[PDB]
Design an enzyme around this catalytic site. Structure first.
Site, PDB file in Angstrom:
ATOM      1  N   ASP G  43      25.753  44.657  38.190  1.00  0.00           N
ATOM      2  CA  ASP G  43      25.232  43.332  38.171  1.00  0.00           C
ATOM      3  C   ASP G  43      26.037  42.433  38.895  1.00  0.00           C
ATOM      4  N   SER G  68      27.144  37.481  38.986  1.00  0.00           N
ATOM      5  CA  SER G  68      26.980  38.301  38.072  1.00  0.00           C
ATOM      6  C   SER G  68      25.636  37.646  37.476  1.00  0.00           C
ATOM      7  N   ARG G  69      24.586  38.566  37.317  1.00  0.00           N
ATOM      8  CA  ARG G  69      23.133  38.042  36.980  1.00  0.00           C
ATOM      9  C   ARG G  69      22.577  37.978  35.783  1.00  0.00           C
ATOM     10  N   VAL G  70      23.586  38.750  34.779  1.00  0.00           N
ATOM     11  CA  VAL G  70      23.009  38.684  33.335  1.00  0.00           C
ATOM     12  C   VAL G  70      23.927  37.756  32.567  1.00  0.00           C
ATOM     13  N   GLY G  71      24.751  36.982  33.282  1.00  0.00           N
ATOM     14  CA  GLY G  71      26.043  36.448  32.523  1.00  0.00           C
ATOM     15  C   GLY G  71      25.755  35.070  31.941  1.00  0.00           C
TER      16      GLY G  71
END
Lengths: 187, 50, 100, 501, 470, 469, 101
Positions: G43, G68-71
């Protein structure tokens, strides 16, 4: 000398076997005997299906060889020594192989031209005699070579029949024509 | 309009399956036995011609 | 099954004929096949590694690879005059040059 | 009727005579097969699969003969028979492939009108001798000012267009076909061009716009397109240049003139990579097999100029290499370069510099010499090359805030104005009578007074002024293609008159 | 020995295998003939595979060959014809005319393979050959018994340079020549054949003073390699049996290297470095040693060489760089700068340059010239960055002489009445030495840089100065 | 008897069967071993002779008993398609892994299709808006276009595609496709949920998006025929229906990657780098099964994962020919802080010309390309010398280029969290203007830092006041 | 390996397996094969500079390569409110300190 070179690997043996047996004029004897000593390995159902593929040393296999020629004394001296050669290089799985090839080489000498006349269904016996007659008449078998017709049933040949022998074939099947047709449908 | 032209193609495929169908019928009958005999005698005739 | 480079048709018919080996393979060798200046001999069973060999052609070699089915001689000279089925004498002297 | 057409198909299946050979299929997949049997085979011959696939045979072995399939392998199955045609691979050549797109087998794939054939031809046709060869003759222009002046191509000659993918690669080639309009329309069939465009590994949408563009400009009445897309079989992709060559050879043979574009040879090598590695030929460098050179080399030499007993025939070729990664020190580029007479290197950076389609003038050479261009147009471009070289050297000095001098800044300015004039435009070629004035103007320094932004403004206007008054000068340049003492003096006075704006 | 019949077993491409009768084989390097639709295919035996099966290379196309097709044994090597009827025939790999002027008719024929001459014969060069072009003459002369090497890039006018030589050196210096083209192109074949017709060196009324062996790159790789052998074998025939002096010419010898790399892979040889042959070393050495001066004639080869992608430390150019006595390098840059000769005046080394062979004056001049150009190139960084007016008085004078030497290295060529249009003029070796010396001395720094452009000796330069003035 | 077989080998996840009768098998067929762990699906891909096929495995081959029985299905792997097939996730073995229950089967069609003809082409000639400035100006989309995406799938390449899904897919495509080869399974659940949240999938009924994900858990051969499965769903929409299509792919490099993995085992000899010797033909088949027809146009957005960031390798390289447009994303522009990370000098389109997007669009874009490239040349001189140790004209160009470059960042709605600046979209029509203005010196008064993270042209001006105060 | 580590739903008990795949770089490496293969799966990155760590700043994160791309929720709110848009700010700072000289 060999007459023609047929077969790829494990034909180098078969080639070599015919040319050694050629000098005496007894290949027919050698080959027949080989069928009868090969079959008695098969009717050894354990260790003659369970020792074709390498599984035991060269030496044990060699001793399996020695035991095969002591129980069958007619095998001819070329085929009693050919077994030694195969056992020392430690192979027995391509044992039927040299045997099969050696038969083709032998039957070129006899002047038999073996042939399969596959059909969709078993044909009548009269249809057979007539194919044997005709095939002789046609210039594919010039004469001098004695055709044999072997009937086979193949329901994968869907209609028609195929006559095959040597490098000469006539395909007069229905099955091929259907396959070609099915592709061709556009309108 | 798209569909109208698609329907011209479709009728041809509907009859295409009659051909496939007709094969199952030919081979379902002992016309399968009788025409296999005919094929053996054509080969004889052909074998005089070569 | 597997294919040896000693599966040669002249060599095989001799073993089939009930003839044994090791009388023409002692020091005594015969070329099986020669390509790219790399004659490969069946024989040379008393040869020393790196030892000098003389062909019938008039060519000299040394025997870097000794392998059981054949010996990969590296030819010092011509490929032209060398061909299959020639005698390869064993000098009995390893590669050596005069010193003085 | 749908029923009537079906009745024919059924009557057109059934019956057939003796088969020279048979063999039963065993190893097969990827559209590559090897069959066991088949002993009256010779190289390049066609064997008819009973699948209804046709495949020619390229590897001969005394084991299992390796037959390259043109179809799929989903209809080939382990046990079938294959029967030898007894006839080597051939393509219809006639007067009826022109005005059509055709695939590598030579059928229309766009469902245009019938292929009229006058003959059949063979994939390998030994390339002309030196006895029927003749000196270079007949200037071929692309209508791109830099290409014509500096690296001038002739008909019967090869110059290689090389450079990174999709930096205008397609516009270069499309501009060339477009300029052949002046000639196609004008009399004399040995001045007319019938171009044959070859597409290997290219997607359909691209070809289908491209052909559209040629129809708009009325250039798809002589264009022939040979195609073998990326999906379609690898042997048809290898086979695609060599049968296109034959559609060209007919033109060369009759005395007529033509131009064959080979775009790209590089994807051709990859289709051949696949083929070669599955018939067990060992590769050399970067898994391209060592007989790659042999493929391009035989091919390009089938376009070469012929003598007057063979009708002054020339097929001309323009090979196209799109470099898959960049670098011309790669294997495939060294091999084509040796065969060809030229490089016409195109550059990525120059695309952004505003030249579109972009050409670099310094990594391009013509060893064909200066007389493969219009005689008039040699004279005017005589110091064009020399000026440009001088610019390049002075510019190199100029970097790093280096102290400039008056001698050099004449050169540097001179060079700057020429490049701005030169800059190509997308999808527009031009006529040589109106290329001859502009280069003159630049060379005699009447363009070295005029500001960089107004280089373009001068270019448009200067051409325009000439159509109105001096239509006699344009006519003479067209008609005699050489420039007279009298004609130059007038052309020179015309330039002196218009300088502002 | 006597003819044999073998039947083909595998056609894979150039390599074609044959399965000859048992106990009876053709030897390595023999010639087998198979009657084919387009000529007679000759097969060179290059390996034996064991079991009485050979592997051979085709020299004619491998289209429509049956595997099972009778292969006659001639009983020997490939033998072409040699003679004094070789002159003007256009000969090809299998050794027969393709210009149909009749076969070469001689009592003597020879094989294409030969062994390089023995050490006892060998002779060295010591005379200094005159080329008749100013760059060549001063900064890289030729040596008669040389193996000159015309390394060069793209767009240098390769054909042009070599074509000039034929105009000058060839008519002047006695003996015959053989011009051999290895992987030539059909543009170049016609242009070379045409240029030697203009000069009356090809006589179709007479016998020619040149012979030709044109093998083109549209013939199989196998053939391209062994075309070279055919042309060399004719030079051997001239040098030995007639005794004649040869000014041998080969074109392009990178093509031999490339061809040789191709049949390597196919024959089973594993790939070596940068995709070239492993057997590079040994094929070249055998080829080169044959080219020499003996106790008979004197053979002075001039061999075109192509430097792939302008790198000459790549394994094919760089190996060849050593084998060739008198290298030159032609470069992209100098062609563009407007100077023809395209030869780099700086990178170009002969096997003889010493002062007790070239002469004491010739050596001291050329020792100066090299230094003057090498200064200007060194000075380029200073000029480039800091400014050009921040260099010293000595540096400006050296820069001005250097520009003059660069444009007083322009000679016109007769075969560049196309390329340029200015007609070629011959100037002597002696004259060049003298002409160059005046310039260094500073006695002609009154002459404009452009009044040194495409002229003869000193006489023409002074006159041409006056001409630009007017 | 039915074409039964035995397992001769288990070399990797490329199982080999040997049929015990001489009856004819065929290629692209399927065979099933009934195993005690679910089912196992195999696919014949080569016939090696002597009644021995060599098979691609679509499911895990762990725990596999040899000499264990096989059966031949008798035909190709068949998916279920429909018009109400939508709102479910499909795997290469037909089943749901989203557990929404059986898909609507109407027509079940082979995942292996014969590529449609050249006589049916409805090439892109209508523009599409993306709503990114850099994209609209330099390399704008079209409808039927084939767009490509280059870069990693963790550095903002993946974030880029999300924006595209948010804009293009909630207002175009009547039935739309997502196909994911080696797709990261938890991230896949995120895509599914975000799609639910924006009310695009409504239960397992009517929906304007469908999805195919084959997880990167699955072994390389199984992954290879995910791609194919997805395209079959795309083609039903293409053929039967005239309704708008889309395709989104993350990544079709992973299809290529899978081919390299299988290549050794099958019986091929790997070509240089590591990529398959059958790359052009294999690549060719999917990309001619993504092609415009007169049965409907097919706008595609494709993503290519670039390993070691070398784009000079043949798998990324051979794609461009099969492309119309690209908007390449790279690590360098990622470091510079410019999000989107799209190269502004490495973008191309077939819609770029002075009468397709018209003369004015072109003129502006040309000038932008010259300016940024001029700056890129002068990187050396600026850093090593200076900007006052460089000519006044080039200094102007250089000063201008820092403003234009900085402006190119567009804070997104899906990078709004990270930046802290609410998401933006800049129109196509606005874009031509925005950039044209800066080029005429009409906005070269205000900070480079005001050109960082702004929306349109007015915001650049307005933030200048925010930072100054 | 990596897809065995991942937060799960309530059904499987809400359990998670947190995975930090740890790569041995030669002074930073992410333009080579091995790193890039891990990046496309993950991610994001926690790129930390060699020079800065070594010269005794820990932590030492370059946020030009840390994403980070879900964070979007994965922090206590307390450490989001106070740390408001500081992640934007230090990604202006490198640029400011380049041309501030």
């Amino acid at each position: 000398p060999p007459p023609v070179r047929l077969f790829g690997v494990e034909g180098t043996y078969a080639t070599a076997l015919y040319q050694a047996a050629a000098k005496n004029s007894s290949i027919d004897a050698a080959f027949q005997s080989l069928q009868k000593v090969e079959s008695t390995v098969k009717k050894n159902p354990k260790l003659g299906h369970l020792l074709l593929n390498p599984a035991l040393s060269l030496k044990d296999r060699n001793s399996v060889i020695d035991a095969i020629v002591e129980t069958h004394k007619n095998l001819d001296g070329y085929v009693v020594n050919l077994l030694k050669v195969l056992s020392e290089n430690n192979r027995l799985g391509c044992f039927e192989k040299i045997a099969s090839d050696f038969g083709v080489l032998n039957d070129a000498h006899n002047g038999l031209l073996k042939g399969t006349v596959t059909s969709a269904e078993p044909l009548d016996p009269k249809s057979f005699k007539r194919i044997e007659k005709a095939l002789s008449a046609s210039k594919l078998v010039g004469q001098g070579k004695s055709l044999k017709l072997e009937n086979v049933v193949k329901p994968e040949i869907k209609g028609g029949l195929i006559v095959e022998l040597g490098d000469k074939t006539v395909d007069l099947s229905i099955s091929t024509k259907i396959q070609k047709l099915n592709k061709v449908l556009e309108d | 309009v798209r569909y109208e032209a698609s329907l011209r193609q479709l009728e041809q495929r509907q009859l295409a399956k009659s051909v496939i169908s007709r094969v199952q019928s030919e081979l379902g009958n002992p016309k399968f036995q009788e025409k296999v005999l005919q094929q053996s005698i054509s080969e004889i005739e052909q074998l005089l011609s070569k | 099954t597997k294919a040896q480079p000693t599966e040669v048709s002249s060599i095989l018919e001799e073993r089939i004929k009930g003839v044994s080996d090791e009388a023409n393979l002692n020091e005594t060798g015969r070329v099986l096949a020669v390509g790219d200046g790399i004659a490969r001999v069946f024989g040379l069973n008393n040869i020393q590694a790196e030892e000098l060999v003389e062909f019938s052609s008039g060519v000299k070699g040394m025997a870097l690879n000794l392998e059981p089915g054949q010996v990969g001689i590296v030819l010092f000279g011509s490929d032209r005059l060398v061909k299959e089925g020639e005698l390869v004498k064993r000098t009995g002297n390893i590669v050596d040059v005069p010193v003085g | 009727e749908v029923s009537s057409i079906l009745e024919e198909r059924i009557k057109g299946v059934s019956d057939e005579a003796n088969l020279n050979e048979t063999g039963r299929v065993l190893a097969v997949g990827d559209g590559i097969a090897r069959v066991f049997g088949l002993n009256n085979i010779q190289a390049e011959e066609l064997v008819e699969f009973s699948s209804g696939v046709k495949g020619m045979a390229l590897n001969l072995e005394p084991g299992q003969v390796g037959i390259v399939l043109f179809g799929s392998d989903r209809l080939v199955k382990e046990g079938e028979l294959v029967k030898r045609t007894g006839n080597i691979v051939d393509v219809p050549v006639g007067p009826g492939l022109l005005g059509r797109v055709v695939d590598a087998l030579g059928n229309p794939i766009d469902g245009k009108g019938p292929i009229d054939a006058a003959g059949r031809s063979r994939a390998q046709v030994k390339a002309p001798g030196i006895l029927p060869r003749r000196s270079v003759h007949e200037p071929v222009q692309t209508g791109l000012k830099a290409v014509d002046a500096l690296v001038p191509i002739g008909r019967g000659q090869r110059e290689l267009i090389i450079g990174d993918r999709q930096t205008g690669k397609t516009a270069v080639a499309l501009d060339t076909i477009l300029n052949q309009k002046r000639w196609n329309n004008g009399s004399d069939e040995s001045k007319k061009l019938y171009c044959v465009y070859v597409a290997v590994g290219q997607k359909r949408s691209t070809v289908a716009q491209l052909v559209q563009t040629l129809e708009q400009h009325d250039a798809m009445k002589y264009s022939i397109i040979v195609a073998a897309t990326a999906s379609e079989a690898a042997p048809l992709q290898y086979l695609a240049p060599f049968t296109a060559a034959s559609i060209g050879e007919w033109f060369r043979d009759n005395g007529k003139h033509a131009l064959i574009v080979y775009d790209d040879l590089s994807k051709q090598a990859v289709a051949y990579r696949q083929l070669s590695l599955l018939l067990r030929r060992p590769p050399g460098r970067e898994a391209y097999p060592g007989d790659v050179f042999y493929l391009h080399s035989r091919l390009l030499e089938r376009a070469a100029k012929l003598s007057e007993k063979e009708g002054s025939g020339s097929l001309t070729a323009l090979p196209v290499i799109e470099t898959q990664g960049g670098d011309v020190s790669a294997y495939i580029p060294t091999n084509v370069i040796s065969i060809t007479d030229g490089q016409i290197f195109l550059e990525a950076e120059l695309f952004y510099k505003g030249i579109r389609p972009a050409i670099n003038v310094g990594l391009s050479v013509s060893r064909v010499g200066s007389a493969a261009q219009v005689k008039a147009l040699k004279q005017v471009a005589g110091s064009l090359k020399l000026f440009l070289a001088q610019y390049r050297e002075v510019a190199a000095f100029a970097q790093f805030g280096s102290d400039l001098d008056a001698s050099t800044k004449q050169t540097l300015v001179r060079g700057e104005r020429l490049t701005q004039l030169l800059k190509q435009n997308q999808y527009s070629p031009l006529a040589t009578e109106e290329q001859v004035p502009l280069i003159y103007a630049g060379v005699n320094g009447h363009l070295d007074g005029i500001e960089l932004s107004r280089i373009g403004e001068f270019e448009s206007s200067f051409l325009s002024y000439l159509k109105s008054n001096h239509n006699e000068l344009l006519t003479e340049i067209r008609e005699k293609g050489e420039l007279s003492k009298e004609l130059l003096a007038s052309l020179k006075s015309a330039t002196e008159s218009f300088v502002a704006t | 020995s006597t003819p044999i019949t073998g039947k083909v077993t595998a056609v894979i491409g150039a390599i074609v295998d044959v399965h000859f009768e048992q106990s009876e084989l053709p030897a390595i390097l023999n010639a087998l003939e198979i009657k084919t639709p387009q000529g007679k295919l000759v097969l060179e035996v290059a390996q034996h595979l064991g079991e009485n099966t050979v592997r051979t290379i085709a020299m004619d196309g491998t289209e429509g060959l049956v595997r099972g097709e009778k292969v006659l044994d001639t009983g020997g090597p490939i033998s072409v014809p040699v003679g004094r009827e070789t002159l003007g025939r256009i000969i090809n790999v299998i050794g027969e005319p393709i210009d149909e002027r009749g076969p070469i008719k001689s009592k003597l024929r020879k094989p294409i393979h030969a062994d390089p001459p023995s050490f006892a014969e060998q002779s060295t060069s010591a005379e200094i050959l005159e080329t008749g072009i100013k760059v060549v003459d001063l900064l890289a002369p030729y040596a008669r018994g040389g193996k000159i090497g015309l390394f060069g890039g793209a767009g240098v006018g390769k054909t042009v340079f070599i074509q000039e030589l034929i105009n000058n050196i060839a008519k002047a210096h006695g003996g015959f020549s053989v011009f051999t083209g290895v992987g030539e192109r059909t543009r170049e074949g016609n242009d070379l054949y045409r240029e030697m017709k203009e000069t009356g060196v090809i006589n179709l009324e007479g016998e020619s003073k040149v012979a030709l062996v044109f093998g083109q790159m549209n013939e199989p790789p196998g053939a391209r390699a062994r075309v070279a052998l055919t042309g060399l074998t004719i030079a051997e025939y001239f040098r030995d049996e007639e005794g004649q002096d040869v000014l041998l010419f080969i074109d392009n010898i990178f093509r031999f290297t490339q061809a040789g790399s191709e049949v390597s892979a196919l024959l089973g040889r594993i790939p070596s470095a940068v995709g070239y042959q492993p057997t590079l070393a040994t094929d070249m050495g055998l080829l080169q040693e044959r080219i020499t001066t003996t106790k008979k004639g004197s053979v002075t080869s001039v061999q075109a060489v192509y430097v792939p992608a302008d790198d000459l430390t790549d394994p094919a150019p760089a190996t060849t760089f050593a084998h060739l006595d008198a290298t030159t390098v032609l470069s992209r840059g100098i062609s563009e700068l407007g100077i023809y000769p395209a030869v780099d005046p700086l990178d170009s080394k002969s096997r003889l340059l010493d002062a007790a062979v070239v002469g004491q004056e010739h050596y001291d001049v050329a020792s100066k010239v090299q230094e003057t150009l090498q200064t200007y190139k060194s000075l380029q960084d200073i000029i480039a960055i800091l400014g050009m007016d921040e260099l010293s008085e000595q540096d400006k004078l050296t820069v001005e002489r250097a520009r003059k030497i660069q444009r007083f290295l322009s000679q016109p060529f007769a075969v560049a009445e196309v390329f340029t249009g200015i007609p070629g003029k011959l100037v002597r070796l002696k004259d060049t030495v003298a002409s160059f010396k005046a310039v260094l001395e500073g006695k002609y720094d009154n002459i404009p840089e452009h009044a040194f452009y495409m002229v003869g000796g000193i006489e023409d330069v002074v006159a041409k100065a006056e001409k630009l003035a007017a």
